[PDB]
């Protein structure tokens, strides 16, 4: 993979070129107005550690922030997402996995009137690598969700537990 952030909007001032997991991105830049993706789909966010606000960025331009939902322009850590040749996860109506289930291989924008039941709390994340949106039509606050369990709403990095959409992560 290979992103280039930007201090400026419209891929003017201070640049760093990265190819890697990153936790700390404040040695290279202060502030991420504007973006390129050469390759590869990348995790930013806001705070060091990957911690804070989360974002998600495929190949392509992003000319200011507001382009990849960002809450600001920070950008303190990122992450590269490996390759996904499959993707399985299942869905819980209650937190630790409890009440109603459903099993997907595909995208979800809108959660709430797809399956049959109406509350999202906890998830099993099979295989490969999704994002996990606040609102429908993946808008909104965005949590990376990688194989394994999430038994609740903090383990996603969330501070409430509000889902509207799910979508895989594949190459761009």
């Known amino acids: 993979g290979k992103i280039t952030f930007y201090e400026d909007r419209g891929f003017q001032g201070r640049h760093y ?16 107005n504007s973006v390129r993706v050469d390759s590869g789909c ?13 974002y998600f960025l495929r190949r392509g331009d992003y000319p200011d922030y507001q382009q990849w939902m960002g809450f600001s322009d920070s950008v ?4 590269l997402i490996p390759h996904s040749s499959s993707h399985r996860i299942r869905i819980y109506e209650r937190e630790d996995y409890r009440g109603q289930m459903v099993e997907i291989t595909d995208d979800c924008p809108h959660l709430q009137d797809r399956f049959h039941f109406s509350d999202f709390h906890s998830f099993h994340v099979m295989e490969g690598y999704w994002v996990l949106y606040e609102m429908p039509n993946y808008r909104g606050r965005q949590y990376l969700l990688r194989p394994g369990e999430y038994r609740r709403y903090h383990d996603w990095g969330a ?10 992560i594949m190459d761009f």
């Open 159 to 168: 501070m409430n537990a509000r889902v509207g959409s799910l979508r895989r």
């Open 17 to 32: 070129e990265c190819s890697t997991d990153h936790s700390n991105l404040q040695p290279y830049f202060s502030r991420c």
């Open 42 to 54: 990348w995790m930013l966010y806001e705070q060091p550690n990957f911690t804070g606000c989360q």
């Open 76 to 79: 303190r850590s990122c992450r």
